[PDB]
Each structure stands twice: as structure tokens, then as C-alpha cells.
Swiss-Prot record:
<dbReference type="Pfam" id="PF00959">
    <property type="entry name" value="Phage_lysozyme"/>
</dbReference>
<dbReference type="InterPro" id="IPR002196">
    <property type="entry name" value="Glyco_hydro_24"/>
</dbReference>
<dbReference type="GO" id="GO:0016998">
    <property type="term" value="P:cell wall macromolecule catabolic process"/>
</dbReference>
<keyword id="KW-0326">Glycosidase</keyword>
<keyword id="KW-1188">Viral release from host cell</keyword>
<dbReference type="GO" id="GO:0003796">
    <property type="term" value="F:lysozyme activity"/>
</dbReference>
<comment type="function">
    <text>Endolysin with lysozyme activity that degrades host peptidoglycans and participates with the holin and spanin proteins in the sequential events which lead to the programmed host cell lysis releasing the mature viral particles. Once the holin has permeabilized the host cell membrane, the endolysin can reach the periplasm and break down the peptidoglycan layer.</text>
</comment>
<feature type="active site" description="Proton donor/acceptor">
    <location>
        <position position="20"/>
    </location>
</feature>
<dbReference type="InterPro" id="IPR052619">
    <property type="entry name" value="Phage_lysozyme-like"/>
</dbReference>
<keyword id="KW-0578">Host cell lysis by virus</keyword>
<keyword id="KW-1035">Host cytoplasm</keyword>
<dbReference type="InterPro" id="IPR001165">
    <property type="entry name" value="T4-type_lysozyme"/>
</dbReference>
<feature type="binding site">
    <location>
        <position position="117"/>
    </location>
    <ligand>
        <name>substrate</name>
    </ligand>
</feature>
<dbReference type="InterPro" id="IPR023346">
    <property type="entry name" value="Lysozyme-like_dom_sf"/>
</dbReference>
<feature type="binding site">
    <location>
        <position position="32"/>
    </location>
    <ligand>
        <name>substrate</name>
    </ligand>
</feature>
<feature type="active site" description="Proton donor/acceptor">
    <location>
        <position position="11"/>
    </location>
</feature>
<dbReference type="GO" id="GO:0009253">
    <property type="term" value="P:peptidoglycan catabolic process"/>
</dbReference>
Length: 162
């Protein structure tokens, strides 16, 4: 198991523009296109992202390409973030994957706001962090996925993904 497989499980793969859990236009492996309500705006952003007239449909290869770029960008945002970096550097590889997943879902900004949980993870107080992470809109809106990531931080293993 690794970050790619983990997120492929959490996000699925769709080759036609779709709406995510928040109702935003997305495609591929959880690649958000736009928060705008306009399908055209979405098709526009899609073509711009792919470099061709897609007509709202992409290939598997294209999806995987966006995906790789998105993972990369998540890691890179973490490393450039003063609040996140130290946490990330303090964690083992499995838990780093949990932090990346959250950043991929919610953006660096979103995650950097879980101050208390972050401090707990930094301190390696796993059970406490898990309880704190659960008191969040994130958990209440996407409880099954949140549970998986939370179990990952709590245990340091991939059991939730097996
Ligand atoms: Cl892009
Ligand atoms: Cl969920």
C-alpha cells in the first residue's frame, strides 16, 4: 500500500466530469475542476488542464497524469507550509500518507487549521489526536473516509485499507 493506492481507494476514478461530495465539478481521481456552478466553466478548466478539447471526457492515462500532479502538489504544499512541515517531518511514513490524504482532500489551508490535532500528532498522542480529529465537519460529512484516515493516524498501519 502507498499514498497513490490509498487515495485511489478514497477518491475512485471517473472519466467523465462529475460532482464531488460537496457538489463541485470534478474528474478523474478526485481532481477538482472548479467550485463554480457552471458546467462550462468546468469543461473549460478541464481542457486547460489536459491541453486538448475534451468535451468533458478524459482517458485513464490523462486521469492518472492529473493524479500524479495533484499528489505532488499536495506534498509540496505540505513542505512549504510552516504549520504542516514540522508535523510531517515528525511522522513515520504511514502516518505521513494520512496527512497527505487530508491535504489532498481539503487543501493545505483546511488542514493547517486543525491546530490542536496537529499538535497532538506532533506529540505522538495517537489516541487523543484521533478523538480530536473526529470532532470536525470533515468527519461528520465524510465519516467513512475520515474513519479510515483517522485509524491510520491512530495505528500507524494500513489496516483500514485492507
Ligand atoms: Cl492542473
Ligand atoms: Cl465517506
Amino acid at each position: 500500500m502507498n499514498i497513490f493506492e490509498m487515495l485511489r481507494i478514497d477518491e475512485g476514478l471517473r472519466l467523465k466530469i462529475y460532482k464531488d461530495t460537496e457538489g463541485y465539478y470534478t474528474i478523474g481521481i478526485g481532481h477538482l475542476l472548479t467550485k463554480s456552478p457552471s458546467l462550462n466553466a468546468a469543461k473549460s478548466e478541464l481542457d486547460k488542464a489536459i491541453g486538448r478539447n475534451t468535451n468533458g471526457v478524459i482517458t485513464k492515462d490523462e486521469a492518472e497524469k492529473l493524479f500524479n500532479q495533484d499528489v505532488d502538489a499536495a506534498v509540496r504544499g505540505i513542505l512549504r507550509n510552516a504549520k504542516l512541515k514540522p508535523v510531517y517531518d515528525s511522522l513515520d511514513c504511514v502516518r505521513r500518507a494520512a496527512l497527505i490524504n487530508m491535504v489532498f482532500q481539503m487543501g493545505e489551508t483546511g488542514v493547517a487549521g486543525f491546530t490542536n490535532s496537529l499538535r497532538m500528532l506532533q506529540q505522538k498522542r495517537w489516541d487523543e489526536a484521533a478523538v480530536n480529529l473526529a470532532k470536525s465537519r470533515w468527519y461528520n460529512q465524510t465519516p467513512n473516509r475520515a474513519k479510515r484516515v483517522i485509524t491510520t493516524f491512530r495505528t500507524g498501519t494500513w489496516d483500514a485499507y485492507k
